[PDB]
Symmetry: D2
Subunit: 103 residues, 4 copies
């Protein structure tokens, strides 16, 4: 009984958004997106995470992320939709753009 509508698996809109974040992987049923970010060291990873934290609390949409030294393993979904929404893709895009500074 999720109160929000999720993007349907394979919907034209979901695919349109996924095109903007091509390094992310759609999970089974298209209920989330995943990306594992890799950096040189923790100092870089933390600089990346710090920007994402500011964005996440601004838009009130937070990553499920696992950091181990120089890697940040991320899964995004909207709990209140039981699946993906526009907000997940917007967060993924911000994260992609923040990570680009390190490549």
């Amino acid at each position: 009984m999720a109160p929000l509508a999720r993007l349907a698996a394979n919907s034209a809109r979901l695919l349109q958004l996924h095109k903007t974040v091509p390094q992310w992987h759609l999970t089974d049923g298209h209920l989330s997106i995943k990306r594992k970010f890799q950096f040189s060291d923790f100092n870089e990873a933390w600089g990346f995470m710090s920007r994402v934290a500011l964005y996440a609390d601004k838009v009130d949409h937070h990553p499920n992320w696992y950091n181990v030294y120089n890697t940040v393993d991320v899964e995004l979904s909207t709990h209140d939709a039981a699946g993906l929404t526009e907000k997940d893709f917007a967060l993924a895009k911000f994260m992609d753009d923040a990570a680009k500074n390190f490549e």
Copy 2:
């Protein structure tokens, strides 16, 4: 040095961080921290990040909004060392500011 499962030093160190739990084989210690919101959780993580890079010993941590699920072990030791317990203690002290 790697701390052997149930070793005197391991058991002694564990008493200093009693809210942590030993995992199978005593290969790591775990604690899940809970805060009021992400803002608090991030303030906590920020202090830990500074400490971690200072001592060059890093947590395996999973953050979801107001929770931080932490597992500590020494990567090149294939188990626990003094550094894990020192990190746990710092984390405990950092979290106490939010109680």
Copy 3:
């Protein structure tokens, strides 16, 4: 709206953040925060940074190791607004965790 010097609303808001001082012309409010070390100071600043970008209202702050010298004013108002006092209050509450 810009709060006029000595205005009823300004004086009322100032009572909520009594450790801050009004500057000349009541153009800004100031407080210098002191912590035990940089690690604490940074934990404090980190929470404030999240809040600042959330509400889109930012401190003028000077950090030297364990001290954070802060002046708040609303850049496009040429004086103080409600947002400055709201930011001051958040900062006060964040600092209290280190007392």
Copy 4:
């Protein structure tokens, strides 16, 4: 009665170090170095500061820095030397490298 030796003004070594951080300005008497960093917004500035904070506490050498939204105005010196030391230039270099990710 500073317990540490400072780099003398115009010393060959001071100049050798300054060459590595050319966007920094030597102040009067060569007692400090200054640089004002500019970013697109606070989110970027914070990502920059976050990396520098980690470095600073690792080496126990901290910037005197003033942040206003997207700008970070920095002055570096070693109090215990009453002037510049190798540590100031090392910090400046780290900061330069962290800022380069945003240009």
